[PDB]
Amino acid sequence: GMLPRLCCLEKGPNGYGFHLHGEKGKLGQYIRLVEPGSPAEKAGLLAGDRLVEVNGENVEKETHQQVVSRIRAALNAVRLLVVDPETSTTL
């Protein structure tokens, strides 16, 4: 598998500045809509990143609601371990 990557976010006045988006039916929580100039952007989060851990807890087998709770639980910073999306395909 692709080497996961650690992103360490510092909570700003309007939160982190990203959407957490699920699939409906099949598991997996993905980052979307990383807002320009946000803490998420500055921490290196990318749209299409698959979220593997929140503060060192694997969240691959957690519901959307549980993952949101884990991110919101953190007082002023959150560590997110992600797997970045593929950028090269041969056709």
Residues of this chain that interact with Cl ion (CB under 5 A) are 50, 83, 85
CB of 75 to Cl ion, least distance (A): 28
CB of 23 to Cl ion, least distance (A): 12
CB of 2 to Cl ion, least distance (A): 8
Question: Do residues 55 and 76 make contact, with C-beta atoms less than 8 angstroms apart?
Answer: no
Across 7-26, b (16+ Cβ under 10 Å) vs e yields: bebeeeeeebbbebeeeeee
Toward Cl ion, which CB reaches closer, 33 or 73? 33
